[model samples]
Target: GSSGSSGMNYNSYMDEKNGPPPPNMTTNERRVIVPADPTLWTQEHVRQWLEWAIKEYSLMEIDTSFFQNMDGKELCKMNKEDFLRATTLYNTEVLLSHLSYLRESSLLAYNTTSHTDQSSRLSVKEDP
Candidate 1:
């Protein structure tokens, strides 16, 4: 029988309470940015990260296109070679060290949230 001991439409209830869920939240896949996190980040943060890396490696110029499509988590995953491949920068050793520092900083920035969910632990890996 269609009858059940307890029947409830949790999704419908949630929709009525909270409105329809955001499109991204409808999927089962874990999102790179936590739904609770302040992902509407500032351009200044992006500028600082890029400028610091550029200054550390003394690059003449950087390709802004490399940044056009990437998000914080994506940027955190890149290493020296990844940057070089995506840009015209040629200094490998110093660039690698700079990238390592960026990874540490990024981890610190994103991991300080007090959220108890597993998504709070989502992070990018550094290259060996």
Candidate 2:
């Protein structure tokens, strides 16, 4: 029995679907999606998210500087291990605080076609 309607109960996993907008977008914009239920902060999900974020952030650091300093062009040249450690330590705490509001929803009883459920609580905005 697939408890969740979708492959991942993102509705119960993300606080508000948002992330650093596309590099092309002007202005410091953020995209948000109204979650169906509260964010699901399961242990496994948290670990996966942490790993993904760390990896992506590391790649961003290596390929390009994702941040700019007031001085000029500043980049954190932290090593991969240190970068992951520092970011994970800080970000994990932050995510925990935000997602603590929601309890873990029912787990997916079975895997289904990997797709998003439009009918569920999903809101997307460009500049709002």
Candidate 3:
């Protein structure tokens, strides 16, 4: 049985409600959603973030071999102690804290979306 409301299929309901989805925004446009940092983020912070983000999103185009070929799950399992051992960064405490925050944010996003309409997670045919 279809679990969608008003007897409409999930896809039909979504299409009718949202109409055609908005075009994907450019990277700069996407970044505009948040204000520029108050120069709080350090170079190390940016480097660590990009490194972790690339792995979390399975960005194959980025070279992550420096981390010894660890995948997302393996990277996430590494504890603060292990994380400290894994990096050569000098700001040990701050680096560990930032890594913790990044890992939690990724986990939280996944869990939150999983509880929403399941069909929303299904794949769609991309326009060529």
The top-ranked prediction according to lDDT is: 1
Q: For candidate 1, list the clashing residue pairs, or say none.
A: none
List the lowest-lDDT window of 10 residues for candidate 3: 29-38
Candidates 1 and 2 compared: the better one by lDDT is 1
Please estimate how well model 3 matches the true structure, expressed as its whole-model Cα lDDT: 0.47
Candidate 3 TM-score, true structure as reference: 0.30
Model 1 residue-pair collision total:
0
5-122, model 3: which lDDT tens digit per residue?
A: 5665555334445456575564542232112231343444445555665566434343334354344344445565665565433433444555566545555545445555644564
Candidate 2 residue-wise lDDT, 7-107, digit = tens: 65445455665678575567544543223233322333434444454575442222122221111111112334543454454553443443443324324
Tell me how candidate 1 scores on lDDT: 0.56
In candidate 3, stretches whose alpha carbon ends up further than 4 angstroms from where it belongs are 1-68, 88-91, 103-128
Error of 2 at 10 (Å): 47
Question: In what order do the candidates fall by TM-score, top score first?
Answer: 1, 3, 2
Q: Residue 124 of candidate 3: its Cα lDDT?
A: 43
* Tens-place lDDT digits, model 1, residues 1-128: 58657777666434445555564455545433222222443444455656666676567655767765566555556666687786654654554565455456556566555776564576756896
Per-model TM-score versus the true fold: 0.35, 0.21, 0.30
Residue 49 CA error for candidate 1 (Å)? 1.9
For candidate 2, which ten residues in a row score worst on lDDT?
67-76
Error of 1 at 108 (Å): 11
In TM-score terms, which candidate is top?
Answer: 1
